[PDB]
Scaffold this active site. Structure first.
Site, PDB file in Angstrom:
ATOM      1  N   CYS B 105       0.835  -1.194   0.000  1.00 29.78           N
ATOM      2  CA  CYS B 105       0.000   0.000   0.000  1.00 29.78           C
ATOM      3  C   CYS B 105       0.871   1.245   0.000  1.00 29.78           C
ATOM      4  CB  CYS B 105      -0.992  -0.050   1.174  1.00 29.78           C
ATOM      5  SG  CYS B 105      -2.395   1.026   0.858  1.00 29.78           S
ATOM      6  N   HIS B 125      -0.335   1.530  -3.518  1.00 34.65           N
ATOM      7  CA  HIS B 125      -1.689   2.057  -3.613  1.00 34.65           C
ATOM      8  C   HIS B 125      -1.732   3.157  -4.668  1.00 34.65           C
ATOM      9  CE1 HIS B 125      -5.524   3.973  -2.581  1.00 34.65           C
ATOM     10  NE2 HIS B 125      -5.818   2.807  -2.030  1.00 34.65           N
TER      11      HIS B 125
END
Lengths: 188, 188
Positions: B105, B125
């Protein structure tokens, strides 16, 4: 005007099934209380993750009612939930006031122990099916998430995101659930 | 003959991205140490779940080496990892000995801060892409899980199961990963 959720956390609970719904529900703006069954002390989960609850169940019980009561799974966690008289009282009160009850994996077996929601369609983890179906008091489903009236059930650690978003949809509606889902990078 | 994993846990970490890999890795028989960046005190994660680490990073650093070092995401957690000189030392040592480094992420942005793995293909992400790509030191990928040499990256909370199983496959092989996957009730 804020919805409220109670998550009951017992020793042996499945930590993924605990943290995913708590996180997703807080992303949706729901006020979540993680209540320790045995007190405020830290809880050792099934794969040895240690989580510190927000409050004891005794204290949280006094700050109800809650729009949803959430029962995580974990075989030993579910057995602790099944043996607790305090859990019996919270669930019967929730059923009587027609609030939502949500349980995942082995968690639904606590509903049978406390005689909650007989006649409903439910799912469990495949390894918990025989336990849940003892006596034929429920109708079994193999859907990843199942919702029959006020009883919402799901199958395993891998269905935890779908389980949590179903709770959000039931409480805050489909648009909020879609908005919370998008930044998570879920496949489907 | 047991593989060892170090998970670095900082305030503001994404608790789903922390607990899913820890749980899945322990299901695979890997010895996992959850090390608190700032000490042994409990860590408040991004959605207010409080996790008690197994050890302080200072202590865990002495019990290496580890077969994988795992960096969870969370914007504020990743920023804390990026500013820590102790993290810099652990990652450079891991890179020099050709051990696996795994980040999810926002977590991969700490690799850029510490100049780890330049030239590798990575994902993050979508909201962290511009930060990761500052200077053009990596090649960007939109795959849900990406592995280039010893750098293994993934995109978000919703890719956490795929991320964790990729670590298991890299360390213990494809058969163990398949065996651990089956009871989780994952969709794909």
């Amino acid at each position: 005007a804020s919805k409220r959720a109670l998550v009951i956390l017992a020793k042996g609970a499945e930590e993924m099934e605990t943290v995913i719904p708590v996180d997703v529900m807080r992303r949706a703006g729901i006020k979540v209380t993680v209540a320790g069954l045995a007190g405020k002390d830290p809880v050792q989960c099934s794969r040895d993750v240690v989580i510190c609850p927000d409050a004891s169940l005794e204290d949280a019980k006094k700050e109800g009612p809650y729009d949803v009561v959430v029962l995580p799974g974990g075989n030993l966690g579910a057995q602790n939930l099944s043996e607790s008289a305090a859990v019996k009282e919270i669930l019967k009160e929730q059923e009587n006031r027609k609030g939502l009850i949500a349980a995942i994996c082995a968690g639904p077996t606590a509903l049978l122990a406390h005689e909650i929601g007989f006649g409903s369609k439910v799912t469990t983890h495949p390894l918990a099916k025989d336990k849940m179906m003892n006596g034929g008091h429920y109708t079994y489903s193999e859907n990843r998430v199942e919702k029959d009236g006020l009883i919402l059930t799901s199958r395993g650690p891998g269905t935890s995101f779908e389980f949590a978003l179903a709770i959000v949809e039931a409480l805050n509606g489909k648009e909020v659930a879609a908005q919370v889902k998008a930044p998570l990078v879920l496949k489907d």
